[PDB]
Scaffold this active site. Sequence first.
Site, PDB file in Angstrom:
ATOM      1  N   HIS A 128      -5.058  -1.469 -13.448  1.00  0.00           N
ATOM      2  CA  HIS A 128      -4.169  -0.481 -12.764  1.00  0.00           C
ATOM      3  C   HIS A 128      -2.696  -0.841 -12.951  1.00  0.00           C
ATOM      4  CE1 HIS A 128      -7.820  -0.585 -10.035  1.00  0.00           C
ATOM      5  NE2 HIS A 128      -7.846   0.615 -10.583  1.00  0.00           N
ATOM      6  N   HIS A 137       4.229  -6.544  -9.002  1.00  0.00           N
ATOM      7  CA  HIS A 137       3.758  -5.689 -10.056  1.00  0.00           C
ATOM      8  C   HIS A 137       4.670  -4.533 -10.197  1.00  0.00           C
ATOM      9  CE1 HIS A 137       2.252  -3.921  -6.330  1.00  0.00           C
ATOM     10  NE2 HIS A 137       2.541  -2.810  -6.945  1.00  0.00           N
ATOM     11  N   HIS A 178       5.074  -0.129 -11.489  1.00  0.00           N
ATOM     12  CA  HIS A 178       4.564   1.151 -11.834  1.00  0.00           C
ATOM     13  C   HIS A 178       5.503   1.765 -12.863  1.00  0.00           C
ATOM     14  CE1 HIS A 178       1.982   1.030  -8.235  1.00  0.00           C
ATOM     15  NE2 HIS A 178       2.991   0.340  -7.754  1.00  0.00           N
ATOM     16  N   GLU A 219       7.580   5.385  -8.048  1.00  0.00           N
ATOM     17  CA  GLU A 219       6.780   5.909  -6.929  1.00  0.00           C
ATOM     18  C   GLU A 219       7.699   6.571  -5.900  1.00  0.00           C
ATOM     19  OE1 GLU A 219       3.789   2.867  -5.880  1.00  0.00           O
ATOM     20  OE2 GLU A 219       2.535   4.183  -7.178  1.00  0.00           O
ATOM     21  N   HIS A 221       7.433  -3.763  -7.310  1.00  0.00           N
ATOM     22  CA  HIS A 221       7.020  -4.030  -5.985  1.00  0.00           C
ATOM     23  C   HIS A 221       6.733  -5.492  -5.793  1.00  0.00           C
ATOM     24  CE1 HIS A 221       5.500   0.331  -5.503  1.00  0.00           C
ATOM     25  NE2 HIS A 221       6.818   0.195  -5.305  1.00  0.00           N
ATOM     26  N   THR A 273       0.331   1.765  -1.909  1.00  0.00           N
ATOM     27  CA  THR A 273       0.352   2.956  -2.763  1.00  0.00           C
ATOM     28  C   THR A 273      -0.823   3.045  -3.689  1.00  0.00           C
ATOM     29  OG1 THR A 273       1.714   2.083  -4.550  1.00  0.00           O
ATOM     30  CG2 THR A 273       2.872   3.106  -2.663  1.00  0.00           C
TER      31      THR A 273
HETATM   32  O1  LIG Z   1      -5.260  -4.235  -5.174  1.00  0.00           O
HETATM   33  C1  LIG Z   1      -4.761  -3.159  -4.690  1.00  0.00           C
HETATM   34  O2  LIG Z   1      -4.427  -2.218  -5.393  1.00  0.00           O
HETATM   35  C2  LIG Z   1      -4.459  -2.963  -3.239  1.00  0.00           C
HETATM   36  C3  LIG Z   1      -3.108  -3.566  -3.033  1.00  0.00           C
HETATM   37  C4  LIG Z   1      -2.849  -4.950  -2.952  1.00  0.00           C
HETATM   38  C5  LIG Z   1      -1.629  -5.497  -2.762  1.00  0.00           C
HETATM   39  C6  LIG Z   1      -0.502  -4.662  -2.748  1.00  0.00           C
HETATM   40  C7  LIG Z   1      -0.648  -3.289  -2.806  1.00  0.00           C
HETATM   41  N1  LIG Z   1       0.464  -2.411  -2.680  1.00  0.00           N
HETATM   42  O3  LIG Z   1       0.356  -1.176  -2.597  1.00  0.00           O
HETATM   43  O4  LIG Z   1       1.673  -2.889  -2.815  1.00  0.00           O
HETATM   44  C8  LIG Z   1      -1.961  -2.787  -2.964  1.00  0.00           C
HETATM   45 ZN   LIG Z   2       3.036  -0.968  -6.247  1.00  0.00          ZN
END
Ligand SMILES: O=C(O)Cc1cccc([N+](=O)[O-])c1
Ligand SMILES: [Zn+2]
Length: 257
Positions: free
Chosen positions: A61, A91, A93, A103, A116, A195
């Site tokens: 993802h 991470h 997006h 986002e 994020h 999210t």
């Molecule tokens: O594994 C996952 O997608 C759930 C998850 C885990 C940690 C942070 C997140 N976020 O929206 O910032 C989401």
């Molecule tokens: Zn995120």
Amino acid sequence: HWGYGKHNGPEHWHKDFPIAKGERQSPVDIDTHTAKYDPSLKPLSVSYDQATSLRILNNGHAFNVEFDDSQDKAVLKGGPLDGTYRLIQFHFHWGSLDGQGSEHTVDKKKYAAELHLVHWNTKYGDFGKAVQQPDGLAVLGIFLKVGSAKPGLQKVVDVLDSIKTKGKSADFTNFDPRGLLPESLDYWTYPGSLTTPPLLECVTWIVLKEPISVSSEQVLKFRKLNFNGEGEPEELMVDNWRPAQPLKNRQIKASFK
Ligand SMILES: O=C(O)Cc1cccc([N+](=O)[O-])c1
Ligand SMILES: [Zn+2]
């Protein structure tokens, strides 16, 4: 299982995760004209001098840069927060093109990407307990625009070839997330959610006003990642963003005049 396609993307998540249609979902559009300056907000305190990154992970993802969160080493405090929140991972997006990927949006403007940095409230002891609480997480969101390269990002970009596909990880030690921060810590804040599924309504969002710049080359390397596993049909990891959700009964507060 959930993802970002036609058949499994954001518009489908509510069937497995009915909280998708809840009262405090993220992301949101930040309407800068209606976000009110709150003089009671504090400066944010971002203390990442002892952060200890360990590993990078393609989870199918996004990719996660993971930290050792077994001591108070990289913490977020102040701002809108009460107490101390420990960094566990960051991470991003991003989009298929530079015109989308973020986002959160700002007056409906979409950035090329959004970073994020996820932190959990130490009063709950572990991440899994924190996500069950309305004040369990603090996520620092940082927009990316395409222009000049971000020297501090390049270590991340160059490891991506080794985690092309879902379930790949690689050692990723000694990476300093201070290199990903903009000059200003001016922010907007509001109560919201994860999210991605499970979309739990456990997050104090802190979205920085000032984007960072990354180069086209850097973001192009994000777009060479794969959602699929090794040796499966290739589907590029792009457009792994949830669109803005209804603000409902929330106020977005600004730390700045
Ligand atoms: O594994 C996952 O997608 C759930 C998850 C885990 C940690 C942070 C997140 N976020 O929206 O910032 C989401
Ligand atoms: Zn995120």
